[PDB]
Amino acid sequence: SAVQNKLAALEKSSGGRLGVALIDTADNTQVLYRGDERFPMCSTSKVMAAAAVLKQSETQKQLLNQPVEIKPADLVNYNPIAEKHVNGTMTLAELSAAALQYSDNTAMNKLIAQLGGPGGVTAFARAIGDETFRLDRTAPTLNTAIPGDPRDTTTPRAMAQTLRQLTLGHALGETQRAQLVTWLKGNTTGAASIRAGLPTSWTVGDRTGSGDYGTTNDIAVIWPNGRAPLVLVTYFTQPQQNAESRRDVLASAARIIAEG
Ligand SMILES: *C(=O)[C@@H](NC(=O)/C(=N/OC)c1csc(N)n1)[C@@H]1N=C(C(=O)O)C(=C)CS1
Protein backbone atom coordinates (compact mmCIF):
# COMPACT_ATOMS: atom_id res chain seq x y z
CA SER A 1 0.00 0.00 0.00
CA ALA A 2 1.02 3.63 -0.45
CA VAL A 3 1.12 4.05 3.34
CA GLN A 4 3.58 1.16 3.69
CA ASN A 5 6.07 2.73 1.28
CA LYS A 6 5.61 6.02 3.14
CA LEU A 7 6.46 4.31 6.44
CA ALA A 8 9.36 2.36 4.94
CA ALA A 9 10.83 5.67 3.77
CA LEU A 10 10.33 7.17 7.24
CA GLU A 11 12.11 4.14 8.69
CA LYS A 12 14.95 4.49 6.18
CA SER A 13 15.07 8.19 7.13
CA SER A 14 15.36 7.28 10.82
CA GLY A 15 18.23 4.78 10.82
CA GLY A 16 16.25 2.48 13.11
CA ARG A 17 13.55 -0.20 13.10
CA LEU A 18 9.91 0.90 13.02
CA GLY A 19 6.81 -1.14 13.83
CA VAL A 20 3.27 0.10 13.20
CA ALA A 21 -0.19 -1.42 13.58
CA LEU A 22 -3.37 0.53 12.88
CA ILE A 23 -6.90 -0.79 13.43
CA ASP A 24 -9.59 1.10 11.53
CA THR A 25 -12.78 0.10 13.34
CA ALA A 26 -14.87 1.16 10.33
CA ASP A 27 -14.30 -2.04 8.32
CA ASN A 28 -11.77 -3.83 10.58
CA THR A 29 -9.09 -2.98 8.04
CA GLN A 30 -5.51 -2.85 9.27
CA VAL A 31 -2.28 -1.13 8.29
CA LEU A 32 0.82 -3.03 9.38
CA TYR A 33 4.53 -2.25 9.09
CA ARG A 34 6.70 -4.95 10.67
CA GLY A 35 3.43 -5.88 12.35
CA ASP A 36 4.62 -9.36 13.37
CA GLU A 37 8.16 -8.51 14.49
CA ARG A 38 8.90 -8.35 18.20
CA PHE A 39 9.70 -5.01 19.83
CA PRO A 40 10.59 -4.21 23.45
CA MET A 41 7.36 -2.87 24.94
CA CYS A 42 9.04 -0.77 27.65
CA SER A 43 6.47 1.27 29.64
CA THR A 44 3.64 0.55 27.18
CA SER A 45 3.33 -2.69 29.17
CA LYS A 46 1.69 -0.55 31.88
CA VAL A 47 -1.62 -0.76 29.98
CA MET A 48 -1.75 -4.54 30.36
CA ALA A 49 -0.81 -4.35 34.05
CA ALA A 50 -3.34 -1.62 34.86
CA ALA A 51 -6.06 -3.47 32.92
CA ALA A 52 -5.28 -6.69 34.79
CA VAL A 53 -5.84 -4.91 38.11
CA LEU A 54 -9.05 -3.41 36.72
CA LYS A 55 -10.18 -6.94 35.84
CA GLN A 56 -9.54 -8.00 39.44
CA SER A 57 -11.64 -5.05 40.63
CA GLU A 58 -14.69 -6.46 38.82
CA THR A 59 -14.82 -9.06 41.62
CA GLN A 60 -13.06 -7.07 44.38
CA LYS A 61 -15.29 -4.01 44.21
CA GLN A 62 -13.24 -1.78 46.54
CA LEU A 63 -9.82 -2.84 45.22
CA LEU A 64 -8.99 0.53 43.65
CA ASN A 65 -9.25 2.26 47.05
CA GLN A 66 -6.90 -0.21 48.77
CA PRO A 67 -3.92 1.66 50.29
CA VAL A 68 -0.43 0.49 49.34
CA GLU A 69 2.64 1.43 51.36
CA ILE A 70 5.41 3.28 49.54
CA LYS A 71 8.72 2.42 51.22
CA PRO A 72 12.20 3.84 50.48
CA ALA A 73 13.25 0.41 49.20
CA ASP A 74 10.45 0.48 46.60
CA LEU A 75 12.06 3.40 44.75
CA VAL A 76 13.69 2.62 41.41
CA ASN A 77 15.06 4.64 38.49
CA TYR A 78 12.08 6.94 37.78
CA ASN A 79 9.58 7.61 40.53
CA PRO A 80 7.89 11.01 39.97
CA ILE A 81 4.65 10.42 41.88
CA ALA A 82 5.65 7.61 44.26
CA GLU A 83 8.58 9.62 45.64
CA LYS A 84 6.03 12.16 46.95
CA HIS A 85 4.39 9.51 49.17
CA VAL A 86 7.35 7.61 50.64
CA ASN A 87 6.69 6.48 54.23
CA GLY A 88 2.97 6.92 53.48
CA THR A 89 0.45 5.16 51.22
CA MET A 90 -1.14 5.45 47.79
CA THR A 91 -4.27 3.70 46.58
CA LEU A 92 -4.22 1.26 43.68
CA ALA A 93 -6.22 3.83 41.71
CA GLU A 94 -3.60 6.49 42.46
CA LEU A 95 -0.86 4.02 41.50
CA SER A 96 -2.65 3.14 38.26
CA ALA A 97 -2.94 6.83 37.39
CA ALA A 98 0.71 7.45 38.25
CA ALA A 99 1.81 4.59 35.99
CA LEU A 100 -0.46 5.48 33.07
CA GLN A 101 -0.15 9.29 33.23
CA TYR A 102 3.41 9.91 34.47
CA SER A 103 5.32 6.70 33.56
CA ASP A 104 5.99 6.04 37.25
CA ASN A 105 7.99 2.81 37.48
CA THR A 106 7.39 2.29 41.20
CA ALA A 107 3.66 2.44 40.45
CA MET A 108 4.11 -0.19 37.72
CA ASN A 109 5.83 -2.49 40.22
CA LYS A 110 2.94 -2.09 42.67
CA LEU A 111 0.56 -3.18 39.90
CA ILE A 112 2.80 -6.16 39.11
CA ALA A 113 2.94 -7.10 42.80
CA GLN A 114 -0.86 -6.93 43.07
CA LEU A 115 -1.05 -9.46 40.21
CA GLY A 116 1.46 -11.85 41.81
CA GLY A 117 4.48 -11.00 39.68
CA PRO A 118 5.10 -10.45 35.96
CA GLY A 119 3.51 -13.83 35.25
CA GLY A 120 0.22 -12.36 36.45
CA VAL A 121 0.40 -9.69 33.75
CA THR A 122 1.16 -12.21 31.00
CA ALA A 123 -1.66 -14.38 32.36
CA PHE A 124 -4.19 -11.60 31.86
CA ALA A 125 -2.95 -11.15 28.29
CA ARG A 126 -3.55 -14.83 27.55
CA ALA A 127 -6.96 -14.63 29.24
CA ILE A 128 -8.06 -11.94 26.74
CA GLY A 129 -6.66 -13.78 23.70
CA ASP A 130 -3.22 -12.14 23.40
CA GLU A 131 -0.83 -15.05 22.81
CA THR A 132 2.10 -12.77 21.90
CA PHE A 133 2.55 -10.39 24.85
CA ARG A 134 5.11 -11.48 27.44
CA LEU A 135 6.15 -9.64 30.59
CA ASP A 136 9.21 -11.24 32.19
CA ARG A 137 10.71 -8.62 34.52
CA THR A 138 9.73 -5.83 36.88
CA ALA A 139 10.64 -2.20 36.42
CA PRO A 140 13.10 -0.89 35.51
CA THR A 141 14.86 -3.91 33.96
CA LEU A 142 11.89 -4.65 31.67
CA ASN A 143 13.04 -1.61 29.64
CA THR A 144 16.55 -2.83 28.75
CA ALA A 145 15.40 -3.13 25.11
CA ILE A 146 18.39 -5.24 24.06
CA PRO A 147 18.26 -6.17 20.34
CA GLY A 148 16.99 -9.71 19.88
CA ASP A 149 16.04 -10.24 23.53
CA PRO A 150 12.60 -11.94 23.61
CA ARG A 151 11.90 -10.74 27.15
CA ASP A 152 9.25 -8.06 27.68
CA THR A 153 8.27 -7.92 24.00
CA THR A 154 5.18 -8.03 21.84
CA THR A 155 4.33 -7.37 18.21
CA PRO A 156 2.52 -4.28 16.88
CA ARG A 157 -0.39 -6.37 15.57
CA ALA A 158 -0.98 -8.07 18.93
CA MET A 159 -0.77 -4.87 20.98
CA ALA A 160 -3.20 -3.03 18.71
CA GLN A 161 -5.81 -5.78 19.03
CA THR A 162 -5.39 -5.90 22.81
CA LEU A 163 -5.65 -2.12 23.23
CA ARG A 164 -8.90 -2.05 21.24
CA GLN A 165 -10.55 -4.73 23.41
CA LEU A 166 -9.39 -3.02 26.61
CA THR A 167 -10.53 0.50 25.70
CA LEU A 168 -13.33 0.01 23.15
CA GLY A 169 -14.26 -3.67 23.48
CA HIS A 170 -15.54 -5.64 26.45
CA ALA A 171 -12.39 -7.31 27.76
CA LEU A 172 -13.16 -5.26 30.90
CA GLY A 173 -16.33 -4.24 32.66
CA GLU A 174 -17.91 -0.96 31.61
CA THR A 175 -16.86 0.96 34.73
CA GLN A 176 -13.34 -0.46 34.33
CA ARG A 177 -13.12 0.28 30.60
CA ALA A 178 -14.25 3.86 31.25
CA GLN A 179 -11.67 4.28 34.03
CA LEU A 180 -8.89 3.06 31.73
CA VAL A 181 -10.11 5.47 29.05
CA THR A 182 -10.04 8.38 31.51
CA TRP A 183 -6.52 7.40 32.62
CA LEU A 184 -5.22 7.15 29.05
CA LYS A 185 -6.82 10.43 27.94
CA GLY A 186 -5.10 12.13 30.88
CA ASN A 187 -1.59 10.90 30.09
CA THR A 188 0.98 13.68 30.37
CA THR A 189 3.95 12.03 28.61
CA GLY A 190 2.65 11.74 25.03
CA ALA A 191 2.55 15.29 23.63
CA ALA A 192 5.52 14.73 21.29
CA SER A 193 4.61 11.18 20.21
CA ILE A 194 1.43 10.00 18.36
CA ARG A 195 -0.50 13.09 19.52
CA ALA A 196 1.94 15.38 17.68
CA GLY A 197 1.13 13.75 14.33
CA LEU A 198 -2.67 13.84 14.45
CA PRO A 199 -5.27 16.55 13.74
CA THR A 200 -5.94 18.69 16.81
CA SER A 201 -9.67 17.87 16.71
CA TRP A 202 -9.10 14.15 17.37
CA THR A 203 -9.30 12.94 21.00
CA VAL A 204 -6.43 10.65 22.02
CA GLY A 205 -5.51 8.55 25.00
CA ASP A 206 -2.09 6.99 24.84
CA ARG A 207 0.73 5.43 26.86
CA THR A 208 4.36 5.92 25.96
CA GLY A 209 7.50 3.93 26.64
CA SER A 210 11.22 4.29 26.17
CA GLY A 211 14.40 2.40 26.86
CA ASP A 212 17.98 1.83 25.83
CA TYR A 213 18.89 1.61 22.14
CA GLY A 214 16.86 4.78 21.66
CA THR A 215 13.70 2.73 22.04
CA THR A 216 10.70 5.05 21.69
CA ASN A 217 7.16 3.69 21.87
CA ASP A 218 3.58 4.89 21.97
CA ILE A 219 0.25 3.06 21.86
CA ALA A 220 -2.92 5.08 21.43
CA VAL A 221 -6.66 4.88 20.91
CA ILE A 222 -7.89 7.66 18.65
CA TRP A 223 -11.39 9.11 18.28
CA PRO A 224 -11.58 11.28 15.18
CA ASN A 225 -14.77 13.84 14.04
CA GLY A 226 -17.92 11.79 13.43
CA ARG A 227 -16.28 8.53 12.38
CA ALA A 228 -15.25 5.13 13.72
CA PRO A 229 -12.36 5.17 16.23
CA LEU A 230 -8.78 4.15 15.53
CA VAL A 231 -6.17 2.10 17.39
CA LEU A 232 -2.51 2.85 16.66
CA VAL A 233 0.72 1.23 17.87
CA THR A 234 4.06 2.83 16.98
CA TYR A 235 7.22 1.07 18.20
CA PHE A 236 10.74 2.20 17.31
CA THR A 237 14.22 1.03 18.30
CA GLN A 238 17.73 1.75 17.08
CA PRO A 239 21.11 0.04 16.59
CA GLN A 240 23.15 2.17 19.03
CA GLN A 241 22.92 1.36 22.74
CA ASN A 242 23.11 5.07 23.64
CA ALA A 243 20.86 6.29 20.82
CA GLU A 244 18.70 9.30 21.63
CA SER A 245 14.92 9.30 21.91
CA ARG A 246 13.07 9.73 18.61
CA ARG A 247 9.48 10.65 19.50
CA ASP A 248 9.36 12.59 16.22
CA VAL A 249 9.37 9.24 14.40
CA LEU A 250 6.18 8.18 16.19
CA ALA A 251 4.56 11.53 15.39
CA SER A 252 5.54 11.18 11.73
CA ALA A 253 4.20 7.62 11.56
CA ALA A 254 0.87 8.77 13.01
CA ARG A 255 0.68 11.61 10.48
CA ILE A 256 1.27 9.09 7.69
CA ILE A 257 -1.45 6.80 8.99
CA ALA A 258 -3.77 9.77 9.42
CA GLU A 259 -3.25 10.83 5.79
CA GLY A 260 -4.58 7.46 4.61
C1 LIG B 1 9.15 2.93 30.48
O1 LIG B 1 9.35 2.93 29.30
C2 LIG B 1 10.18 3.60 31.46
N1 LIG B 1 11.53 3.56 30.92
C3 LIG B 1 12.58 3.32 31.72
O2 LIG B 1 12.48 3.22 32.94
C4 LIG B 1 13.89 3.14 31.04
N2 LIG B 1 14.75 2.69 31.88
O3 LIG B 1 14.75 1.28 31.89
C5 LIG B 1 15.94 0.84 32.56
C6 LIG B 1 14.48 4.05 30.06
C7 LIG B 1 15.76 3.93 29.64
S1 LIG B 1 16.15 5.16 28.50
C8 LIG B 1 14.53 5.78 28.67
N3 LIG B 1 14.13 6.86 27.99
N4 LIG B 1 13.77 5.11 29.52
C9 LIG B 1 9.61 5.07 31.70
N5 LIG B 1 8.92 5.53 30.50
C10 LIG B 1 9.02 6.73 30.08
C11 LIG B 1 8.25 7.05 28.84
O4 LIG B 1 7.08 7.39 28.89
O5 LIG B 1 8.92 6.92 27.72
C12 LIG B 1 9.80 7.83 30.64
C13 LIG B 1 10.17 8.88 29.92
C14 LIG B 1 10.13 7.67 32.10
S2 LIG B 1 11.00 6.09 32.30
Numbering used by the authors: 27 to 57, 59 to 238, 240 to 252, 254 to 289
Verbatim from the authors:
The CTX-M β-lactamases are class A enzymes that have a broad substrate specificity that includes penicillins and cephalosporins, including the oxyimino-cephalosporin cefotaxime. In addition, Lys234 is located near the proton shuttle residue, Ser130, and may act to lower the pKa of the serine hydroxyl to facilitate proton transfer to the nitrogen leaving group of the β-lactam during the acylation reaction. Structural results suggest that the slow acylation by the K234R enzyme is due to a conformational change in Ser130, and this change also leads to decreased inhibition potency of clavulanic acid.
The E166A substitution blocks the deacylation reaction, which allows trapping of the acyl-enzyme intermediate. As with the ampicillin structure, the carbonyl oxygen of the β-lactam in the cefotaxime acyl-enzyme is in position to hydrogen-bond with the main-chain Ser70-N and Thr237-N in the oxyanion hole. The C3-carboxylate group is positioned for hydrogen bonds to Ser130, Thr235, and Ser237, similar to the ampicillin-acyl-enzyme. The Ser130 Oγ is 3.9 Å from the cefotaxime N5 leaving group nitrogen, which is outside of the hydrogen-bonding range. In addition, the Ser130 Oγ is 7.8 Å from the Lys73 Nζ and is not in position to accept a proton as proposed in the catalytic mechanism. Indeed, the E166A/K234R structure with cefotaxime shows a methylene group at C3, indicating that the R2 group has been eliminated. In contrast, Ser130 is critical for cefotaxime acylation, and consequently the change in conformation with the hydroxyl turned away from Lys73 and the β-lactam N5 nitrogen drastically reduces catalysis.
